[PDB]
Design a protein around this ligand. Structure first.
Ligand SMILES: [Mg+2]
Ligand SMILES: [Mg+2]
Ligand SMILES: [Mg+2]
Ligand SMILES: [Mg+2]
Ligand SMILES: [Mg+2]
Ligand code: NA
Ligand code: NA
Ligand code: NI
Lengths: 855, 283, 283
C-alpha cells in the first residue's frame, strides 16, 4: 500500500513500496529517520542473494553472508478507518525480527520460517502518516543449508470491525466422513470470536459452505448459531455444526475445494466476514499395508523440498513455487515433505489446488544446535517469550518451540493437502552432548501437537532408528501410542525389515531417502576432476543410496508407506561432496555452492534420473528416455570402446536401434522385455529378468546395453504387453540421441506466453544451444545475454551449475550442458515483453510475452 | 481574507508580495465566475437542469501531461451515459474516444445518486461520482455527448456546462455582456458586465490576462472591477484590471435619473467590445 | 522502407519509436491484403468482373462522424446504378437510403468511363468516379444493390468487394484459409494462410489486433508472418504477430518430401482455426 482505507479487502497485499538498508550500525526505528538514500524494494525480498560469495563464509550455506537488514514503510491510514482494528501479518522473516510502529517497539520473533503477526491498532495514527519498521538479524552461522535473509515471504494487512473472528480463528472437523461419504456429512466447527468494543455483543454466526469461486447460491450447507453474549474485551470459542449435503471429495486426481464463510452478526447486522479454504478427505496409516486416502490404498511417491527458488534466492514467489510443483507432478510425485521447516503459505495454496499431499515439517534441530551453527534455532527452541513481546500467532505460555509449532498449525489446520505434522529432523545428529533428554522433549512436542490438532497424525524423520538407539525406540513408541507415524531416515531394505520385526506396532515410512548426487548432462564417466558429478544413477553419499536402490527397497514393501527422496530440486548450499560445516572454501575457488542432490536442477531443468522416477511413478504418461548424449567428447568408453547406454521406461518391451551418420536406415541393436511383479496389497512394478540381467537386483529396474562408439543416432522403440507400439506422441523423454554439429543457434521458449500484469507473475524462458539442425549441443557452455524490452524486467538468470559464481541478477550467464534460463517478471500495467537471447557467433532467439490486466 | 494555504493570523505578508488576499475555498470566485467544481455540485444537486461539463481547457500551455503525454480529462454530468469524442484541428469529423455509464443508487429514505462502477473505475470510491479519461494531447477539440437511461440523446439546449473544449488561437477580441440590460434608476441597482477574452472565433483563451480598461459614460457609474484572482492587489475602484483565466468583470450602478449607460471595454492590440444599459424611472 | 510521410533520408528515427518502417503508397499492403482503393481501381480497370464495394466498416468506434453525426459512405462500383440500403440491428427488413446512376463517357479513340452527374454531385470532378452518401450512424447493416443499364440486377456471385458492412460484436474466433491447398514438395513453393479475427457470426472485427500464434506441423515450415502494419517491428520470423485491422497472415513453405502440412491459428480467449495443406512430389 501507499495508503490504507476502506474498502480494501479484509486482508490485503502489503508487499509494495518498502525501503531497505543493510547496516549493523544504523538505528532507524524513528518515523522521522531520513531514509532518502535507501533502496526502494517490493517484497518478498532476500538480501543474501544480492551479496557476493566469499571464502570467509561457509560452504554449508552457499558461501553467502547474512547480516543486519532494516525495512521501512511509510503509509497513510485514512480517517475512514478510525474505529477499525489493524494488524500486519508476516508469513516469514529470516530471522530474529524486531518490529516497531510509529516509534513504539512491538516485539520480536527468532524463527526464520514460522508465520507471525502484530496488532497495530493501539499505535496507529488514523488520518495520518504511519511508519512500520522491521529490523532483521541473520547473524551467521544459523543454517545447515542456504537460508537467505529478510522478508522473503508475503506481507499483508488485516482490517476488521471491533467485533471479529480471531486470527486463524476457524477450526473444522469431519470425524465421520468415511462413513457419511456421499450423504449428509457432519462438520463440527469451532470459531473464536473477539469483542474488542466497549459494550457486550449479542452474537450469532452465519456459516456457509460453498464451492471455491463460487457463490453462496451454490452452498451445500449452512447454519445459524443461537445468540451468545460475548462481553466487551472478551472472546469466546463458538461451536457450531454444519450438515454438508454430499460434498465432493478432495482427491489427488480431483482436488475439489470449498470456501467456508463465517459472517459475524451483532444485533441484526453483519460486522465481519471470514473465509477459510477446506477440502473433504480422510487418511489412514496401517502397520502392515501403509497409507490410504479416502479409503483407497495410495503409495507415497514423495520428494523432500527446501524453500529457496534458485536464482531468485529465498523469495517465495507464488509462480516460482507453483512451477516446482508442476515439474514434480510431471515426474509422478504425489507428495512433498517441507524439509525442514514450515512452508510458505503459497506452497500450501498450490498443493490444495493441485492435489499434492504435504507432510509439513516444523523443525530441524530441537534444543541443541547442529554443525557448529551457534545462531540456529537450537539456541531459541527452549527460551521463553518476554511478557511485553506482543508477537501473535501461537501459544505464548511455554517456549518458542510451542509458539512456532502452534503458529504453524493454526495457519494450516484446514488445508486438505496437509496430511501430517512433522516435528523434527535428525534431532540427535550433528549435535554435542547427551541425548538422554530427547525422549521427553519429543513426548512434549507430541502432546502439544495432539492438543493443537486432533485430526492429523504427527511424525518426525529420525536417522538413529537404523542404529537402534534406545532413545529412538522410546520416541517411536511414544509417536505410536499417540496415533503418530514413524519416519526413518536412510534405512535400506534389510533395515526396513528389522524395524518391522522389532516393532510390529509401528506404522513406518522412508522420511528421507536416496541422497543420490549427480550433475545435469554429465556422461564422460558413469561413477562418482571438474567440480561436477556423473548423470548416471551410480553416485550417492555414503549414508545414502542410488535412486533405483532406494525405490526398489520401498516398492516391494507394503508396510513401508512411501518415500521422500532427498531432494526434488537442487537447492543453494550443502554442496556435498564438496560440503563444509565451518569457515573456508572446499577445493579450488570458485567452489561448488549449491546441491547435487536434486532430481531437477535449480533452474528446473531435469536431470536424467527424472525419467527413471517418471517411469516408476507417473501412470498418466509413458516414458522412454535414453542416456548418454551421443557425442564422442562426452561419452565414456569401457572395454572395447563400448559405451553404457541406459533406457528408463515404463514400457513392457524395448527395441534399441542404431543409425549411422548420414544414413536413413536403422539396424536393430537389442531387444529387452520387463517382468511384472505384484505385492500382497496390489502394487505392481517392473523388473528385467533376462539372462544378461545385472547382478545387482535394483539396477534391473531399468535397461542397459553396452554399445560400441560410432557417430550417428541411437534410438528406441517402446511396446506394450500386447506387442503394440507405444507412439512418440504419448511418451516423454529423449527416445533418440544423435551426434551433433558445433553450436550454431540459440532456441528460446517461454513456459507461459501470457501472464498476469500484477508485478508478481513470472515467465520462465529456457534457452537451448543447438547445432544447425536443432540438436542440443550437450557440452555447450556459450555465454548468453538477454535483452528484455517492454512491460517487464529480468529478475534472474540460471544454469544450475554448482561451481558457477556469476551473479543471478546479471543479464548474462554461461549455458551449462547446453541449457540456460532467464526469469522475467511482469509490471502492474498490461503490455507485452520482448526478450532476445544472444551469443557471439550464434543465431539469436526472441520470445514474446503478453501481460494481462488484473480483473 | 483567509487565503489558506497562504493564511496568516498575525501581522506580516505570507510568501512574496503581493500575497494572496482572498479565499480559495469558494465554488464560485469573488467576481461570481464559477470554478469547474461548480458543475460537479450541479450534476449532484440541481434536478431542474442537466449538466455536461468538461475540464481541462485544451491548449498545450495549460494542460498537464502524465504518463504517455496523457492528459487527465474529467467530466461532470447527471446523465446516465457519456460518449467522449476527439476532433482534429481543422477537421469536421470526430472519433469516439470512450464511453462510460453510471449506476443508480437508492437510500432507504428514497434519495438517489450516481456512481461509476465500470472496470476502470477509480480505486477511491468518491472519485467515481464523476468520470475520468486519460487522453493523449493533440491540437483540436474534445467534445461529449450525454444520454439518458433509454439511450436517448440529451440535447445541448437542455444542458449547462462546457460540452466541448478546443485549442484556441491567440487573444483577438473582447466580448462583453450585461447580465441585466435594464436596471432601476434608484441610485442603487447594479448591472454586472462579464468580459471575455477570446480568439478570432470566439473561443475563450484559457490563460489570457490582458489588461482591460473600462470607459463608462451616461446615466451610471463604474463602482467596481474584479477578476477573482487572490494575489491581485489592484484597486477595486480603478477603471482597469487584468483579466484572469480569460475573464474580467465590471460593475456599474445606476443614478437616480432615468437614461442609458454606455460601457466600452478595451485592451491593447485587441478588438474592443461595447454594451449599453438603460435605466428606468420610479413612479 | 520509404515510410512517407514518416520518411527520413539520413540517420535516426522519425516520430516516437517504434517508427513506421514500410510504405503507405501501396494499393495492396505488404501481406497482400488489399486496401479499399483496390476496388476503386478494379471498378475502373477489370472488365472481366463486376465491383460493388462499400466503406467504412460499420462499428461505432471506427467511423468518422461529421455534422449531424453523419458518416461519409463511399461506394466503388462499375455498375450503371446503385441502390443503397439500411437494416437496423435486430431487423430483417431493409429500407432504401438512396439511389444514384452513372453517366457513360466516350473519348475520341473510343475509350469509355463513368462519372456521376447528379445534382448532388461533388464540386471536385474526379471524386465523381465513385459514389458518396452521408448517412447518420446507427447500429446495423449498410448494404448495396447493383444494376446494369437495362435495370437488371447484378447478382453477388458475379461481383467482388464488400457489398455490405455490418456492426460486429466482440472478437470471438479466428477464421483461417490457405490460398492454395495443394502445393509442390520442392522446398520452394508456398501456401499463403490468411487469418481473420471475427465475431460469433463471422463478421471481421474492423479494429481487431489480437496476437495470433501459429503452430506448424508436418511436411512444411513457417517462413513469414505479416500484418502489413508500418510501425510494427515484430520479427517476421516469429511464430506470432498481432492482427491489424482484423487480419494477419502466415507464409508456409514445403519441404522436399511429399506429405501434409497442418497449421493451427490460436489466440487468447478466441476459438482456434486449423487448416491442412497437401504437398505433392515433383514428377
Ligand atoms: Mg524455483
Ligand atoms: Mg507411466
Ligand atoms: Mg489574528
Ligand atoms: Mg540516405
Ligand atoms: Mg468490371
Ligand atoms: Na540418480
Ligand atoms: Na440534473
Ligand atoms: Ni556451520
Amino acid at each position: 500500500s501507499s495508503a490504507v482505507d476502506s474498502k480494501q479487502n479484509r486482508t490485503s497485499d502489503f508487499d509494495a513500496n518498502w525501503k531497505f538498508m543493510l547496516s549493523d550500525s544504523v538505528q532507524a526505528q524513528d518515523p522521522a529517520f531520513d531514509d532518502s538514500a535507501w533502496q526502494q524494494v517490493d517484497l518478498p525480498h532476500d538480501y543474501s542473494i544480492t551479496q557476493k560469495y566469499s571464502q570467509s563464509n561457509e560452504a554449508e550455506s552457499a558461501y553467502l553472508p547474512g547480516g543486519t537488514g532494516w525495512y521501512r514503510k511509510s503509509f497513510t491510514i485514512d480517517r475512514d478507518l478510525a474505529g477499525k482494528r489493524i494488524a500486519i501479518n508476516f508469513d516469514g522473516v529470516y530471522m530474529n525480527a524486531t518490529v516497531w510502529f510509529n516509534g513504539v517497539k512491538l516485539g520480536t520473533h527468532p524463527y526464520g520460517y514460522s508465520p507471525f503477526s502484530f496488532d497495530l491498532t493501539g499505535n496507529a495514527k488514523f488520518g495520518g502518516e504511519n511508519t512500520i519498521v522491521v529490523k532483521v538479524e541473520n547473524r551467521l552461522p544459523s543454517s545447515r543449508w542456504y537460508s537467505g535473509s529478510g522478508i522473503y515471504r508475503d506481507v499483508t494487512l488485516t482490517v476488521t470491525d471491533g467485533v471479529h473472528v480471531g486470527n486463524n480463528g476457524v477450526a473444522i472437523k469431519t470425524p465421520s466422513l468415511a462413513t457419511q461419504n456421499g450423504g449428509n456429512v457432519t462438520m463440527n466447527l469451532t470459531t473464536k470470536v473477539a469483542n474488542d468494543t466497549e459494550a457486550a455483543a449479542n452474537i450469532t454466526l452465519k456459516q456457509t459452505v460453498f464451492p471455491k469461486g463460487g457463490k453462496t447460491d451454490a452452498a451445500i450447507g449452512t447454519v445459524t448459531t443461537a445468540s451468545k453474549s460475548i462481553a466487551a474485551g472478551a472472546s469466546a470459542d463458538v461451536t457450531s455444526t454444519i450438515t454438508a449435503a454430499s460434498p465432493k471429495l478432495w482427491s489427488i486426481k480431483n482436488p475439489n475445494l470449498y470456501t467456508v464463510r463465517t459472517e459475524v452478526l451483532n444485533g441484526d447486522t453483519v460486522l465481519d466476514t471470514y473465509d477459510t479454504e477446506y477440502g473433504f478427505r480422510w487418511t489412514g496409516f496401517d502397520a502392515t499395508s501403509g497409507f490410504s486416502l479416502n479409503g483407497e490404498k495410495v503409495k507415497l511417491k514423495g520428494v523432500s523440498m527446501h524453500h529457496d527458488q534458485g536464482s531468485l534466492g529465498a523469495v517465495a514467489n507464488r509462480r516460482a513455487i507453483e512451477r516446482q510443483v508442476e515439474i514434480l507432478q510431471k515426474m509422478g510425485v504425489n507428495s512433498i515433505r517441507t524439509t525442514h521447516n514450515p512452508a510458505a503459505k503459497a506452497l500450501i495454496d498450490v498443493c490444495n489446488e493441485k492435489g499434492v499431499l504435504v507432510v509439513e515439517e516444523v523443525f530441524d534441530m530441537w534444543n541443541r544446535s547442529k554443525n557448529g551453527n551457534t545462531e540456529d534455532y537450537g539456541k531459541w527452541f527452549g527460551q521463553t517469550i518476554a511478557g511485553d513481546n506482543a508477537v501473535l500467532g501461537g501459544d505464548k505460555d511455554e517456549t518458542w518451540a510451542k509458539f512456532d509449532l502452534t503458529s504453524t498449525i493454526n495457519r494450516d489446520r484446514n488445508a486438505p493437502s496437509v496430511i501430517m505434522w512433522s516435528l523434527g529432523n535428525e534431532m540427535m545428529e550433528g549435535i554435542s552432548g547427551s541425548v538422554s533428554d530427547f525422549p521427553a522433549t519429543s513426548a512434549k512436542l507430541v502432546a502439544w501437537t495432539k492438543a493443537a490438532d486432533s485430526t492429523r497424525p504427527m511424525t518426525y524423520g529420525d536417522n538413529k532408528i537404523k542404529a537402534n538407539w534406545n532413545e529412538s525406540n522410546t520416541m517411536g513408541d511414544n509417536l505410536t501410542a499417540n496415533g503418530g507415524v514413524v519416519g526413518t531416515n536412510y534405512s535400506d531394505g534389510a533395515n526396513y525389515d528389522k524395524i518391522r520385526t522389532t516393532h510390529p506396532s509401528w506404522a513406518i515410512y522412508g522420511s528421507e531417502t536416496a541422497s543420490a548426487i549427480n550433475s545435469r548432462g554429465i556422461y564422460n564417466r558413469t561413477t562418482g576432476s571438474d567440480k561436477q558429478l556423473t548423470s548416471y544413477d551410480n553416485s550417492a553419499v555414503g549414508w545414502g543410496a542410488v535412486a533405483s536402490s532406494a525405490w526398489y527397497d520401498v516398492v516391494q514393501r507394503d508396510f513401508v508407506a512411501g518415500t521422500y527422496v532427498w531432494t526434488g530440486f537442487d537447492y543453494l548450499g550443502e554442496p556435498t561432496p564438496w560440503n563444509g560445516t565451518g569457515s573456508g572454501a572446499v577445493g579450488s575457488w570458485p567452489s561448488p555452492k549449491n546441491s547435487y542432490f536434486g532430481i531437477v536442477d535449480t533452474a528446473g531443468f531435469p536431470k536424467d534420473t527424472y525419467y527413471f522416477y517418471q517411469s516408476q511413478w507417473n501412470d498418466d504418461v509413458h516414458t522412454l528416455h535414453i542416456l548418454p548424449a551421443w557425442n564422442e567428447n562426452v561419452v565414456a568408453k569401457g572395454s572395447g570402446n563400448k559405451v553404457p547406454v541406459v533406457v528408463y521406461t515404463d514400457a513392457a518391451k524395448v527395441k534399441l536401434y542404431f543409425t549411422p551418420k548420414g544414413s536413413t536406415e536403422k539396424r536393430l541393436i537389442g531387444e529387452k522385455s520387463f517382468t511384472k511383479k505384484t505385492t500382497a496389497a496390489g502394487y505392481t512394478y517392473q523388473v528385467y529378468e533376462g539372462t544378461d540381467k545385472d547382478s545387482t537386483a535394483h539396477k534391473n529396474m531399468y535397461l542397459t546395453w553396452n554399445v560400441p562408439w560410432a557417430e550417428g543416432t541411437i534410438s528406441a522403440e517402446a511396446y506394450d504387453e500386447n506387442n503394440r507400439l507405444i507412439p512418440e506422441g504419448s511418451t516423454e523423454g529423449n527416445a533418440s540421441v544423435t551426434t551433433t554439429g558445433k553450436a550454431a543457434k540459440l532456441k528460446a521458449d517461454a513456459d507461459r506466453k501470457t501472464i498476469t500484469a500484477d508485478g508478481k507473475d513470472l515467465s520462465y524462458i529456457e534457452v537451448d544451444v543447438t547445432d544447425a539442425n536443432g540438436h542440443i549441443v550437450p557440452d555447450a557452455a556459450n555465454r548468453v545475454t538477454f535483452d528484455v524490452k517492454g512491460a517487464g524486467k529480468l529478475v534472474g538468470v540460471d544454469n544450475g551449475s554448482s561451481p558457477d559464481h556469476d551473479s543471478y541478477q546479471a543479464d548474462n550467464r554461461k549455458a551449462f550442458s547446453g541449457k540456460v534460463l532467464a526469469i522475467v517478471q511482469s509490471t502492474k500495467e498490461a503490455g507485452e515483453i520482448t526478450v532476445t537471447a544472444k551469443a557471439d557467433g550464434l543465431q539469436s532467439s526472441t520470445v514474446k510475452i503478453a501481460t494481462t490486466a488484473v480483473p
